[PDB]
Amino acid sequence: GVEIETISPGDGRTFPKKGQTCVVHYTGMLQNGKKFDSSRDRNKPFKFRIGKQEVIKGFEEGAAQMSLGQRAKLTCTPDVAYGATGHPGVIPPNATLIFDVELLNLE
Amino acid sequence: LLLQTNLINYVTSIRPNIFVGRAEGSTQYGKWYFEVMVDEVVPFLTAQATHLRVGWALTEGYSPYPGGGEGWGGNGVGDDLYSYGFDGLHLWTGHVARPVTSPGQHLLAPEDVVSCCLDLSVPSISFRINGCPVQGVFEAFNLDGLFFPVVSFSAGVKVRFLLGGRHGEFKFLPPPGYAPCHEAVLPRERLRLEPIKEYRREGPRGPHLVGPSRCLSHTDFVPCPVDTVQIVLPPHLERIREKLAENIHELWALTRIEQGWTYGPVRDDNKRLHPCLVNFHSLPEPERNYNLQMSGETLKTLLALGCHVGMADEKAEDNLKKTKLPKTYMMSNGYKPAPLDLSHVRLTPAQTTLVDRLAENGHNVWARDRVAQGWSYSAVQDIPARRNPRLVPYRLLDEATKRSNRDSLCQAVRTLLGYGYNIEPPDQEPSQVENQSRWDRVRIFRAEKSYTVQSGRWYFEFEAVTTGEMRVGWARPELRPDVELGADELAYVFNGHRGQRWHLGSEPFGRPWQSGDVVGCMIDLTENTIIFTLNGEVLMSDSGSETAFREIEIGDGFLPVCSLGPGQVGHLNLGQDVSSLRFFAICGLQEGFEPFAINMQRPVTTWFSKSLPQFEPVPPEHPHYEVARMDGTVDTPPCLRLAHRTWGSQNSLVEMLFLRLSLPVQFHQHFRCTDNRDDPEIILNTTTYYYSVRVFAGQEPSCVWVGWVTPDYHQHDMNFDLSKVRAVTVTMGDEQGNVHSSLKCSNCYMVWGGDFVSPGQQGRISHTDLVIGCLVDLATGLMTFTANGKESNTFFQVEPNTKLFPAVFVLPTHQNVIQFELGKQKNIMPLSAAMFLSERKNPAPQCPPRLEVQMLMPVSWSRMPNHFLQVETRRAGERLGWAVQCQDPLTMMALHIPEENRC
Amino acid sequence: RRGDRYSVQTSLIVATLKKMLPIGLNMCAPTDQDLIMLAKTRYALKDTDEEVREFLQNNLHLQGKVEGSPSLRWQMALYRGLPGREED
């Protein structure tokens, strides 16, 4: 339920499966181009464990689709995002999300 | 509602001085091809993604000033409609990215090749990545101005310009018919890599404030001579029709006799033994009488220029003789000078200027004829391709060819002068090449208002590197950015281009400088004196007074100000390091004076008058213009009526006026698929909003333009019409033609009111007010218009997420000009709900105090950053092309205004 | 015009001193300006040349301080920046 688009080719042969932590430098943005989130401002890679649904499912599925070391662009609809409820005070309800995902490494 | 902040990198653009364009009778070719190589690109040197775009841009509005700007800062190629770019995955124009398919599409990586093609014969910009075509072609973009290669880049990139020929190899066969951009280089100059128009450059002693740059124009490549047809040939000219031809029948032949190009009886001209000094009777008859009527043609040029002849002294025929010199001796029918001989004769400067423009009108007719036979310019000569290195107008020609043309006709006018016939100069008419853009002439520089001084003896130096137009002195902090220095009371400035001091008029003072001179400005607020010094010498007024000004009130303060005219470079030395000053010890040090910034750790921040129009609200005390806001009546909606205060009075300000509302409207993000009482559910489910403007009686609709503008519309035109509206269409298809996506972009969506009037014989001043309304559909991006309650054929369609400002452009012709009516129509919601989310369910029109009419002043103040990017531009090699290097990162905090979409 | 016949402002004797002033004040160190300013006051008190000289003898220590006046710091750095200025 998401759309991906590669930006810069990386491995193209390895896929992130269960058992290894997924490490990204992502940059989420609003539908109108209003940047709200990133990791390079924090200057630290974001590590999250694939499998227990701790992150949003659109991001999870997009990261599962795209390979290792390959800079990507994602697009999460409100149906796969926070949607009607919305993130409190950050993301308005029923907002389209755009992600400048960079899966830099696994583990 | 609240301003947003972010950390944004610094983006700069580097261009080669290769300018191309098309016009009627153009001397340039319509197809050009150039490439860019990528050596090293750092993806994320900082938090923000590295910027890198390549493509073309336009010389008449693309000024990417460093720092904040339209959109989200870091403006480069594609951020507006004056440039066309390709980042590696999208086509960039009007600050909108549109994805494009490529065989292995990715953002521009190290060791990649981009093939950029421009066609000027028909609007089309094709792009290829590593030779693989990209299915994107720009269409329907204006040809006015000049086009040039340009690269927009943030820090951390190393790119190479490949221009072909001696300036590159392209590593790929260029498409046929596309001449490499290295062949457009002019002979008077040499190819180099320079940034876009700047206000500062590094200097060996210190940074130089760089005045506006003179820019070449497409109109300067069309040769426009004076027509030499409708001239009846006079008797005194047919009387001298012969000698002035006989003297130019072999004048070009005289130089080379008794050399390797020495004539022979068997052959004739153009056979590497050309001269044939005998006579033109031996020479062929058509070119013979052609040479006669070319002598007549030069005399006809003299007539059209304003030259007339009169005979006074002894006839030169008597006191002239032919000299059989030992040189130029020939065996073919005796020896003689190849032209007709002449004795000692001289020429005055009037004749020098006249023969200069006479050669100009010869060159421009020759170039016009060649163009009419299809030829064009190329720095390398190609005869089968019909291109020449000398097909440029005379003003752009090289000095060698200028002299070579002028020599022959100088001999001709000399021979005319020998016979005593006067060469009469015509009348003198002063003309200016460019007049409309009076503001892109001087770039005022002043310090921050925080450093304003109220006392003490302050001194600073401004080095006048050139001898052009520069003004330096002191001024109050409220200096208007679009008013000349000294024209008002808000400046005490000195101009040493003509020995002039400016304060509320003109009065002689001192002497003009020369190149390299340093002007040290003295000031004593305690003693109420202002003095100027030049190269350690105190400037003198036209009396015993040695002070520029006296009896000055302290007021709100004064500030060190300097300005620079076109083509000017000047160093400002506020004296942060006292040793930097050269003449301070000579003058000022022993007088107790101090440098302006003597004890300041950081260099004083300077502000320059930015030459970029920005919509800002009208001052309430505007002498000429006024906006009337009246409360909405039960029968009429609230309106914003514009009234000209001083119309019909003496010395009124009349000029083209640009107006817009202060708030925009945004379309829906996704477009939908595929008596007199409103319908309650239609009025709640409608997505089209209406406003109108009531063009009052006495205002001519032929000079009224009504419509919409996007916030990036930054064009100021005194003679505005719908032809100059910026537009471009991105056209996309699959890998084999089949164009399936054609989206149009424009900064102005506006309809001329002159097409909405009754085409009567007379009575153009309508007694009934013309009420033109504009309607926008957000759910589809559809723009429609109503003339007098009936729809017109004009309509527009745009992409979602676009913001359009209600704009009415008009040249006033009455005391009552226009009136923004915030009305409504049946089952159509007024703009009061479109502007404000809180009023989205309110059908009643309302005019809240935030919404107010803005007008476009071309010049506004701006800040230059305390640091600038460091770019290394050099010629890496003939095959390597020109290499651009920039690695040091610089980031700035940008405050983004949301509703105006600018930071 | 105003003072063609005679005028104080165009007097050459004072004018030559006006031109010659930078060289005269060039010798003196601006740290001694406290002595200079007090000198006019004691001149106005009708004190002759010898007794103001012994006033300077009694007040040799009354020079200024470069550290407390940052305006003097760059002035004195340029003052010893002059090659003709010896510390003795």
From Swiss-Prot, chain A:
Keywords from the named record: Cytoplasm, Isomerase, Rotamase, Sarcoplasmic reticulum
Subcellular location: Cytoplasm; Sarcoplasmic reticulum
Cellular-component GO terms for this entry: calcium channel complex; cytoplasm; membrane; sarcoplasmic reticulum membrane; Z disc
Cystine pairings recorded for this chain: none
Regulation: Inhibited by both FK506 and rapamycin.
Keyword Repeat: no
Reaction(s) the record says it catalyses: [protein]-peptidylproline (omega=180) = [protein]-peptidylproline (omega=0)
Assigned EC number: 5.2.1.8
Protein name from the UniProt record: Peptidyl-prolyl cis-trans isomerase FKBP1B
Source organism of the structure: Homo sapiens (Human)
Name of encoding gene: FKBP1B
From Swiss-Prot, chain B:
Entry note about domains: The calcium release channel activity resides in the C-terminal region while the remaining part of the protein constitutes the 'foot' structure spanning the junctional gap between the sarcoplasmic reticulum (SR) and the T-tubule. Pore opening is mediated via the cytoplasmic calcium-binding domains that mediate a small rotation of the channel-forming transmembrane regions that then leads to channel opening.
Source domain of life: Eukaryota
Region (Interaction with FKBP1A): 40-51
Gene encoding the protein: RYR1
Signal peptide: none
Modification comment: The N-terminus is blocked.
Tissues/organs with expression: Detected in skeletal muscle (at protein level). Fast- or slow-twitch skeletal muscle.
Sequence repeat coordinates: 212-325, 326-439
Note: Binding of [3H]ryanodine indicates that the heterozygous channel is activated by Ca(2+) concentrations 4-fold lower than normal. Single-cell analysis of cotransfected cells shows a significantly increased resting cytoplasmic Ca(2+) level and a significantly reduced luminal Ca(2+) level.
Protein's UniProt name: Ryanodine receptor 1
All residue ranges annotated as the B30.2/SPRY domain in the record: 1-168, 384-579, 675-827
Protein's cellular compartments: Sarcoplasmic reticulum membrane
Family membership: Belongs to the ryanodine receptor (TC 1.A.3.1) family. RYR1 subfamily.
Oligomer and partners: Homotetramer. Can also form heterotetramers with RYR2. Identified in a complex composed of RYR1, PDE4D, PKA, FKBP1A and protein phosphatase 1 (PP1). Repeated very high-level exercise decreases interaction with PDE4D and protein phosphatase 1 (PP1). Interacts with CALM; CALM with bound calcium inhibits the RYR1 channel activity. Interacts with S100A1. Interacts with FKBP1A; this stabilizes the closed conformation of the channel. Interacts with CACNA1S; interaction with CACNA1S is important for activation of the RYR1 channel. Interacts with CACNB1.
Function, as annotated: Cytosolic calcium-activated calcium channel that mediates the release of Ca(2+) from the sarcoplasmic reticulum into the cytosol and thereby plays a key role in triggering muscle contraction following depolarization of T-tubules. Repeated very high-level exercise increases the open probability of the channel and leads to Ca(2+) leaking into the cytoplasm. Can also mediate the release of Ca(2+) from intracellular stores in neurons, and may thereby promote prolonged Ca(2+) signaling in the brain. Required for normal embryonic development of muscle fibers and skeletal muscle.
Provenance organism: Oryctolagus cuniculus (Rabbit)
